[PDB]
Amino acid sequence: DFCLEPPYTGPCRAAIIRYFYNAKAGLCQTFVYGGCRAKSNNFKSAEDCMRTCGGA
């Protein structure tokens, strides 16, 4: 959801993108959010990706 599980790309709205953490394939990925409380996960670079689930 934020680091491995399936990121929310459109739970409320349509579909918006940015960076997520896909800690299995190559880690830092993309999905931003698609409505709701922006699903908290919402990165844009390595520093972003890291502060949330990269180096926590």
CATH level-1 class = Few Secondary Structures
How far apart are the termini?
A: 16 Å
Radius of gyration: 10 Å
Oligomer type: monomer
**At CATH's second level, what is the architecture?**
Irregular
| Element-by-element helix/strand order | EEH
Record field, number of beta strands: 2
The number of helical segments is 1
Number of domains: 1
Strand composition percent = 5-15%
What fraction, in percent, of the residue positions are helical? 10-25%
Strands ordered across the widest β-sheet: 1-2
Structural class designation: alpha+beta
Function: Inhibits trypsin, kallikrein, chymotrypsin, and plasmin.
Domain BPTI/Kunitz inhibitor: 3-53
Disulfide bonds: 3-53, 12-36, 28-49
Subcellular location: Secreted
What is the gist of this entry?
The PDB classes it as inhibitor. This protein is α+β, with helices and mostly antiparallel strands and 56 residues long. Helix content is 16%, strand content 14%.
What topology emerges from the helices and strands here?
Layout: E1 19-22, E2 27-30, H1 46-54
Antiparallel strand pairs: 1-2
Question: What does this molecule look like?
Answer:
By secondary structure, the protein is an alpha+beta fold. It has a single domain (1-56), classed as Irregular (Factor Xa Inhibitor). It is 16% helix and 14% strand. The protein contains one helix and two strands. It has a two-stranded antiparallel ribbon. The radius of gyration is 10 Å and the shape is globular. Residues 3-53 form the BPTI/Kunitz inhibitor domain. This is Pancreatic trypsin inhibitor. One of its GO terms (cellular component) is serine protease inhibitor complex. Keywords: Disulfide bond, Pharmaceutical, Protease inhibitor, Secreted, Serine protease inhibitor, Signal. GO terms for molecular function: calcium ion binding; molecular function inhibitor activity; potassium channel inhibitor activity; protease binding; serine-type endopeptidase inhibitor activity; sulfate binding; zymogen binding. The PDB classes it as inhibitor.
